[PDB]
Amino acid sequence: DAELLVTVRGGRLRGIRLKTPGGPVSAFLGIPFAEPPMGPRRFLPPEPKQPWSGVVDATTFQSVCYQYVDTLYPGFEGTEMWNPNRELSEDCLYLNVWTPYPRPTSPTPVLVWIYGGGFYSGASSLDVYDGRFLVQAERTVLVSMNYRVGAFGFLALPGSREAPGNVGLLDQRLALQWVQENVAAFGGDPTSVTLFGESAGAASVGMHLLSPPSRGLFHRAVLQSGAPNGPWATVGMGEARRRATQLAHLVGCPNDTELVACLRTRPAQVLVNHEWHVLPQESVFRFSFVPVVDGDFLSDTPEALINAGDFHGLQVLVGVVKDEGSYFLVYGAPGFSKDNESLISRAEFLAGVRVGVPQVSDLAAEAVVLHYTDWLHPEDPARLREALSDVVGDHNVVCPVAQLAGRLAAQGARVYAYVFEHRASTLSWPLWMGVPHGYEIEFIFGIPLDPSRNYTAEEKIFAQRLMRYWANFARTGDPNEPRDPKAPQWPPYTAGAQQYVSLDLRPLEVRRGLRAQACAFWNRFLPKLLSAT
Amino acid sequence: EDAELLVTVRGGRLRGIRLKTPGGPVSAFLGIPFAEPPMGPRRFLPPEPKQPWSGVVDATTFQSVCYQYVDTLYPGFEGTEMWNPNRELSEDCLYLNVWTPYPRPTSPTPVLVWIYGGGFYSGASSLDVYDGRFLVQAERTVLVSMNYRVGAFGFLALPGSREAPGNVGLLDQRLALQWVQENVAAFGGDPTSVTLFGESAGAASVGMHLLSPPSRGLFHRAVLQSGAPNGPWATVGMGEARRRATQLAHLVGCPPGGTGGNDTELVACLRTRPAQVLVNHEWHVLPQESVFRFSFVPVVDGDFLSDTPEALINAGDFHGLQVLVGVVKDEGSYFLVYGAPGFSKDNESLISRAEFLAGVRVGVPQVSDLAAEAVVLHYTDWLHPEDPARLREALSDVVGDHNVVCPVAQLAGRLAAQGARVYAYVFEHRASTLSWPLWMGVPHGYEIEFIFGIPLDPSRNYTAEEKIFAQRLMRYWANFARTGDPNEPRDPKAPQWPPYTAGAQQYVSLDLRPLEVRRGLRAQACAFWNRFLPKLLSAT
Ligand SMILES: O=C(/C=C/C=C/c1ccc2c(c1)OCO2)NCCCCCC[PH](c1ccccc1)(c1ccccc1)c1ccccc1
Ligand SMILES: *[C@@H]1O[C@H](CO[C@@H]2O[C@@H](C)[C@@H](O)[C@@H](O)[C@@H]2O)[C@@H](O[C@@H]2O[C@H](CO)[C@@H](O)[C@H](O)[C@H]2NC(C)=O)[C@H](O)[C@H]1NC(C)=O
Ligand SMILES: *[C@@H]1O[C@H](CO[C@@H]2O[C@@H](C)[C@@H](O)[C@@H](O)[C@@H]2O)[C@@H](O[C@@H]2O[C@H](CO)[C@@H](O)[C@H](O)[C@H]2NC(C)=O)[C@H](O)[C@H]1NC(C)=O
Ligand SMILES: *[C@@H]1O[C@H](CO)[C@@H](O)[C@H](O[C@@H]2O[C@H](CO)[C@@H](O)[C@H](O)[C@H]2NC(C)=O)[C@H]1NC(C)=O
Ligand SMILES: *[C@@H]1O[C@H](CO)[C@@H](O)[C@H](O)[C@H]1NC(C)=O
Ligand SMILES: [Br-]
Ligand SMILES: [Br-]
Ligand SMILES: [Cl-]
Ligand SMILES: [Cl-]
Ligand SMILES: [Cl-]
Ligand SMILES: [Cl-]
Ligand SMILES: [Cl-]
Ligand SMILES: [Cl-]
Ligand SMILES: [Cl-]
Ligand SMILES: [Cl-]
Ligand SMILES: [Cl-]
Ligand SMILES: [Cl-]
Ligand SMILES: [Cl-]
Ligand SMILES: [Cl-]
Ligand SMILES: [Cl-]
Ligand SMILES: [Cl-]
Ligand SMILES: [Cl-]
Ligand SMILES: [Cl-]
Ligand SMILES: [Cl-]
Ligand SMILES: [Cl-]
Ligand SMILES: [Cl-]
Ligand SMILES: [Cl-]
Ligand SMILES: [Cl-]
Ligand SMILES: [Cl-]
Ligand SMILES: [Cl-]
């Protein structure tokens, strides 16, 4: 029919009709938004895709940007769900739009999704990011895009013109510039676009909020289990150059301008293979090529930009899962596996602190064990397991997002905070991991509504409730419904009251304090300790 | 009216008094000279044994109180007047007292020795709440208490000097212990089973006695109530002791130095100044403005204390030792009204955060800025950082934990880990007669009333449940003195009081409710004070 042919500023498109229980929606998958960043364009800021003859086959997802794939638990759904589900390519700068089947007559608010995965992995084509349920249930249009990861997106020789850094973030900004120009052609309202992303995606949303040349491209922001001020999300210029030159040394690449020309000669698969070998210490929740504080894009460290900014006119929805740290322990913590119950020794715990909190002093590590061991049960392996799970999750996600939330609200933002604490009935991961990092996404996207997946019916109502909260936020800057006071109110997070809500099968329960007592240590005391020792 | 009231000790004849309790009478010998008066040239000098006397000594009334500051904070208030000296002040104060049961026991009976508290600057055995008669009547033990020099009179030191060597208040105590070694037999007491018990500075001194070998031959069991020798307030270094002493001499105008030595001339000038002028400038030698700090305390001099108590604790001779230790529930509250901004017994002391942050700087005086921030981290409720009610209770914890709770918790674990049999309690019943306000809970010093059986005095308006409580407590203590074990020799149903161990850390709760066995003596808080905080101070 004619609903599946739309033409944007660069050429004609041919979409696909997707089927949901609630009805059909129309999808345009794999839209080129940049000239392929190959050869001399590798490590370079993206260039806008020039117009094309003919019609683009936009019926299936395009390729995945080159990334390391996870072989810890081969064939296991818990890890394979996040692995690439299409061919790897450096020709990967494509985006996707979902829109309702009766194409909207009125301008509709748009959600744009930025996938996570520690700036080294991820793809928009993942099944857990399927847009159809969100646009069919709540009648918004949804855009997602691929951005370069690993060294291809975030290797930097700071100061150089040929490896400037943050081109994966510039990939994102370019796609946002694309929706301003082209989301109108699909029923989307350029004047109400909401960014939402999880993990490294959430941090990417944060950095767009701190980068003036992009803050004009969106109006609301959702940060799921991530913040740009996290200890893992940025590196200094000196460390970025230190990591880039050692990668070149590892692939036999003997100044800056010759260093980068050499790297463009290596096949992309050769760079990927040496990615994790450049890290300065053996560590958990650390990644080799992430955004760099260079003055371009990030005028200052994200913590500074957060501290002295004005956020009036901004609504932000942020939150964490209940067990942020558990997922990461099985990726390098001594004594941890998905297959046993991971009851660690005190010696394994004490060693786990040094790898969970890498590159801090001996005194700092003692401070961590002082705050996290139970001195009536210093040896109980279950308590040490839960303890190290907290250490990693708090230091890396909750305390970074709690710090961002307190300062945004205190400086003019309207902030709503959640803790997602429902364990999916479908969870392949063991039960000691609780609600792991990344396992709200399924519900936010309404995946329980897929008949092929056997989620319970109470779970399907949960996702419909959740995707309404999100849509509601995107439309209004408020998850609650305006003509519905009887429904339990989601109060704004504020620096003093620190109110958040709980997302599980029970109605909205309002709790106060986002692990306040622990994040006082990470956000307040610990920097003072490091600065004076 | 009998012959039980005429006893002869190694130095002469004594004349006692019959004392009255409801349950019966006891015979008491008060004001027994155990040392030659430390006057004139004897000021600041180690005590000398009382020379023997012709005739009979009148041992019928309490002797004098050692010269000390009197508390002028709340005149006429029972809460503060309770501890104030209730006899004439004099430097002639080295006298002791003995209580013994009527018909003095046929058998050798164990003896309890009491050492009073008051931060080494105050206190006397003459206080009403230290009246021995009730428990010596109730439990058939003999009880001894003694006066020791306090303030500069007991603990001024120029380390190395012959004329002010320090710890002479402790040497006063040691002299009294060897006195019972020679003479408690004359009263029915067994020199070979004597138990020391004391509160705060008393508790610290009994603790210090078991770390000084020449005192371990003088007792066999030890009770430490709300005090420990390793407390941050209980000892000073030689350098700080000389610094605090010389500054007192300058404050009362002692320049001269014509011949001899600088040290010996400095003290001779101090010997000439009246006692009350020294008392008046006592609190001015403190290095910073503080609560729970006292200027003249024992010094680590190499003699009495060969090393710091925390050192001496670690490598001690403690196997075969029974020790009973505990704290009240609100240790810090009493001390806040003596310098913490925003606090009064008459106010509800709802403090601001700005006042709290200033209060940690005075409760925890001797430390760096980074250390002080660490204290605010663990004790602030970051969900209600401004709530004045929580800030009030919070600062109470900082002072209570830092000064008594964590020091006795540290001493109890290390005694247990080296072979001692340690029993631990938490006293958490609030006397109905409480003079102090309600926010102070059970303050520092208000278990003493019950331990001594003051609820049984008809003059006082204690409740009926309180008098049975005191009888139970007086039994716990007596049992320990007799056996090294407070609970019943083989009670079938009364809940057993387990020994405190370094791993299980079991203690009991002392209130009208039966023995509650709890685990962990503020374990999570004292990890900061006993373990993390010293590393931080040594590393900044
Ligand atoms: O803690 C981490 C990071 C983990 C998370 C990834 C993730 C997953 C799903 C997500 C997501 C993020 O956000 C949204 O959803 N740690 C690194 C582990 C990542 C995978 C393999 C790397 P590691 C290695 C190298 C250097 C330092 C530390 C770790 C490895 C180590 C121990 C056990 C298993 C794997 C490796 C690299 C190259 C060859 C062999 C092994
Ligand atoms: C929990 O399991 C981990 C890993 O156990 C096994 O790893 C494979 C070798 C295989 O046997 C799987 O069935 C298990 O998952 C234990 O930690 C490992 O211990 C082995 C020694 O047996 C050592 O060689 C590895 O390096 C260890 N791995 C790590 C990451 O430390 C751990 O001890 C188990 N917990 C227990 C037993 O309480
Ligand atoms: C709580 O009380 C203290 C002092 O207790 C007394 O309370 C009053 C009835 C008044 O008569 C005071 O003079 C008493 O000492 C208060 O602390 C002092 O407050 C005054 C008033 O401005 C001030 O000048 C002093 O510096 C304060 N003392 C300090 C800071 O050490 C305190 O303010 C009272 N809190 C209240 C009433 O909320
Ligand atoms: C880096 O290394 C050498 C000199 O240190 C030099 O090759 C690079 O720039 C060169 O500039 C020359 C000017 O025309 C010319 O030889 C060529 O453009 C280029 N060389 C190349 C690409 O191999 C140096 N680059 C810097 C200093 O930025
Ligand atoms: C549940 O769904 C899985 C795939 O997600 C499928 O393999 C399985 O057969 C389903 N359950 C049943 C009982 O059929
Ligand atoms: Br244990
Ligand atoms: Br012994
Ligand atoms: Cl054409
Ligand atoms: Cl499996
Ligand atoms: Cl419409
Ligand atoms: Cl740009
Ligand atoms: Cl930062
Ligand atoms: Cl600031
Ligand atoms: Cl170090
Ligand atoms: Cl247990
Ligand atoms: Cl507002
Ligand atoms: Cl399981
Ligand atoms: Cl709550
Ligand atoms: Cl005489
Ligand atoms: Cl005679
Ligand atoms: Cl008898
Ligand atoms: Cl005292
Ligand atoms: Cl000296
Ligand atoms: Cl000094
Ligand atoms: Cl307590
Ligand atoms: Cl508050
Ligand atoms: Cl409240
Ligand atoms: Cl509470
Ligand atoms: Cl009152
Ligand atoms: Cl505690």
Residue numbers in the entry:
A (entry chain A): 5 to 258, 265 to 543
B (entry chain B): 4 to 543
Paper text:
Based on these observations, enzymes involved in neurotransmitters breakdown (e.g., cholinesterases (ChEs); monoamine oxidases (MAOs)) are among the main biological targets for the development of new therapeutics. We then evaluated the compounds’ inhibition profile and binding mode towards cholinesterases (acetylcholinesterase (AChE, EC 3.1.1.7) and butyrylcholinesterase (BChE, EC 3.1.1.8)) and MAOs (MAO-A and MAO-B, EC 1.4.3.4), as well as their antioxidant and redox properties. To gain insight into the binding mode of TPP+ conjugates to hAChE and hBChE, attempts to solve the crystallographic structures of the complexes formed between compounds 2–5 and recombinant hChEs were conducted. Compounds 2–5 bind similarly to hAChE and compounds 3 and 5 bind similarly to hBChE, although distinct binding modes of compounds to hAChE and hBChE were observed.
For hAChE, the electron density map corresponding to compound 3 can be observed in the active site of the enzyme, identifying clearly the location of TPP+ moiety at the entrance of the active-site gorge of the enzyme (bottom left). Strong stacking interaction between aromatic amino acids located at the rim of the gorge of hAChE and the TPP+ moiety was not detected. The electron density map locates the benzodioxole moiety of compound 3 at the bottom of the gorge in a pseudo T-staking interaction with Trp86. Parts of the electron density of the linker between the TPP+ moiety and the benzodioxole ring of compound 3 are missing. Nevertheless, electron density is clearly present around the oxygen atom of the amide function interacting with Phe295. Indeed, compound 3 was the most potent hAChE inhibitor of the series (compound 3: hAChE = 2 µM), while compound 2 presented the lowest IC50 towards hBChE (compound 2: hAChE = 200 nM). While the TPP+ moiety was present at the entrance of the active-site gorge of hAChE, in hBChE it was located within the gorge in the vicinity of the active site.
